[PDB]
Amino acid sequence: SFSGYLKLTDNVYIKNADIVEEAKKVKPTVVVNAANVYLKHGGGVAGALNKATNNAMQVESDDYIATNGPLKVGGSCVLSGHNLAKHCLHVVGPNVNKGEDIQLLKSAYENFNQHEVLLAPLLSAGIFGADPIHSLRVCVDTVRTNVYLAVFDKNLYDKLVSSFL
Numbered sequence: 001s002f003s004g005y006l007k008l009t010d011n012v013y014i015k016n017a018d019i020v021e022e023a024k025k026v027k028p029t030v031v032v033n034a035a036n037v038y039l040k041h042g043g044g045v046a047g048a049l050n051k052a053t054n055n056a057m058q059v060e061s062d063d064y065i066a067t068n069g070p071l072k073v074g075g076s077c078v079l080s081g082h083n084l085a086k087h088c089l090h091v092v093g094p095n096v097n098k099g100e101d102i103q104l105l106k107s108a109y110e111n112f113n114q115h116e117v118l119l120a121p122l123l124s125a126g127i128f129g130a131d132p133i134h135s136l137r138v139c140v141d142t143v144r145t146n147v148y149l150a151v152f153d154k155n156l157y158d159k160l161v162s163s164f165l
Ligand SMILES: Nc1ncnc2c1ncn2[C@@H]1O[C@H](COP(=O)(O)OP(=O)(O)OC[C@H]2O[C@H](O)[C@H](O)[C@@H]2O)[C@@H](O)[C@H]1O
Pocket: 017, 018, 019, 020, 034, 035, 036, 040, 041, 042, 043, 044, 045, 046, 047, 048, 093, 121, 122, 123, 124, 125, 126, 127, 128, 129, 132, 150, 151, 152, 153
């Protein structure tokens, strides 16, 4: 039931939309969160997803960390999607603004290949400081399963869809 997406490649689609609103409407099997290793969902995609779950995502995440410890940069875990999706795949892109290696963005996107269909954001392209077009290119060149990208920012979307991949 994904609607209004622009096709980028065989398997990658993109839309200027809030991932929270897409998730609410579509109720996908998997929504991806752009997480940090502590699953502290403060802002951006994570903060918005968590707010939409009325903090249930954070409560669940705190138990996950208490049991298992921090994720790896480039790593992931599958948790509930609460009222938004069946599952949330929390994926940690590199925090390039804090010196983490941009190469780990490829490792981060590889987690998507474990799921047939995902609704996802551009990892690392916000507060983590990776160039957004680079994140999109890594996504296209790494993910082989079917990924529906929700780009909140209109100006960014318009630039991305007019750029070579
Ligand atoms: N509601 C939204 N829907 C779709 N895209 C969004 C939304 N909000 C932001 N974006 C875009 O989504 C992209 C990613 O922006 P970011 O969410 O910062 O993720 P990161 O991987 O760079 O930083 C991770 C940290 O962000 C959190 O604080 C976490 O808790 C982590 O600490 C950008 O292009 C945004 O414009």
